[PDB]
Swiss-Prot record, chains A, B:
Function description: Cytochrome c' is the most widely occurring bacterial c-type cytochrome. Cytochromes c' are high-spin proteins and the heme has no sixth ligand. Their exact function is not known.
UniProt keyword Metal-binding, yes or no: yes
Source species of the chain: Alcaligenes xylosoxydans xylosoxydans (Achromobacter xylosoxidans)
Quaternary structure and interacting proteins, as annotated: Homodimer.
PROSITE patterns: CYTCII
Predominant location category: periplasm
Subcellular location: Periplasm
Post-translational modification remark: Binds 1 heme c group covalently per subunit.
Record's protein name: Cytochrome c'
Annotated heme c binding sites: 12-13, 67, 116, 119-120
GO biological process, one term: electron transport chain
InterPro entries to which the protein is assigned, alphabetical: Cyt_c/b562, Cyt_c_II, Cyt_c_prime, Cyt_c_prime_subgr
Record's signal peptide: none
Length: 126, 126
């Protein structure tokens, strides 16, 4: 869907911006500093689920650039494993949210965050 | 969810970027220049539906900036009418996509595009 590689870069950076907001805005909830409203979090995690599927299609062939490492493309199966595992962790977060289980939400949230960081450590330029 | 107004601006601009991609990537389909796969479009319009609900919450109080006109806030009911009407047009696009009705999709697509433009004309700085 991208006329030029720059358009893919802009897309995936914007998807990442939205994911960071929808994930990070729950930090105060998981820490107990903001109240836990199960319906609110369920809805927010549904948005995050949709968003968290979006970046990967924007690392398509020829879309090199931004702060994306070339090993994303040269090690395609490994990068895929990381994004699929991240979305697996998102599924677990969804299950926790859908159940209205705060303890499960905290745990799942931590696992998601670790998966974001693990990918950035390997595949995002400093 | 925004620590500073700049964070709201960044969010809504990123949501707009993603909406522009998910809407605009259908242009070749509506024009017949790319093939129509009903399932593909149904899925894409579901993503667009999710995205198209997102910008409005990021024009919250104190989030003035970017290319957002101040009349967004001083005429709150009027701006609301425009975003609600836009999402109404998105619902019509969803119905067309879900039905697998290409003629209905073309028509709905045009109405959505007109709604984007009508808001920008009134509420987005040149
Ligand atoms: C690999 C499988 C990733 C996972 C999982 C997550 N992110 Fe990511 N992120 C990744 C890359 C390769 C890049 C660079 C993209 C580019 O072309 O520049 C990013 C970037 C970000 C950014 C910065 C966006 C920008 O402003 O330019 C943010 C804020 C970000 N990523 C956040 C984020 C979060 C919150 C994640 C988990 C919920 C997450 N990312 C996962 C690769 C990967
Ligand atoms: C008002 C109800 C709007 C509707 C409907 C749509 N858009 Fe919009 N858009 C609006 C404003 C007020 C702004 C400026 C935001 C800011 O603070 O700068 C925008 C911006 C955009 C942009 C530019 C984003 C950027 O790169 O900075 C794009 C690409 C955009 N809008 C696209 C877009 C599309 C495709 C829409 C319909 C599907 C649409 N917008 C509707 C206000 C409104």
């Amino acid at each position: 869907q991208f006329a030029k590689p720059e358009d893919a870069v802009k897309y995936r950076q914007s998807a990442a911006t939205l994911m960071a907001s929808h994930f990070g805005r729950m930090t105060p909830v998981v820490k107990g500093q903001a109240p836990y409203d199960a319906a609110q979090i369920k809805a927010n995690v549904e948005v995050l689920k949709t968003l968290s599927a979006l970046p990967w299609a924007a690392f398509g062939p020829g879309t090199e650039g931004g702060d994306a490492r070339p090993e994303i493309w040269s090690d395609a199966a490994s990068f895929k494993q990381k994004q699929q595992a991240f979305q697996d962790n998102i599924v677990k977060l969804s299950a926790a949210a859908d159940a209205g289980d705060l303890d499960k939400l905290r745990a799942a949230f931590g696992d998601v965050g670790a998966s974001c960081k693990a990918c950035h450590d390997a595949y995002r330029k400093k």
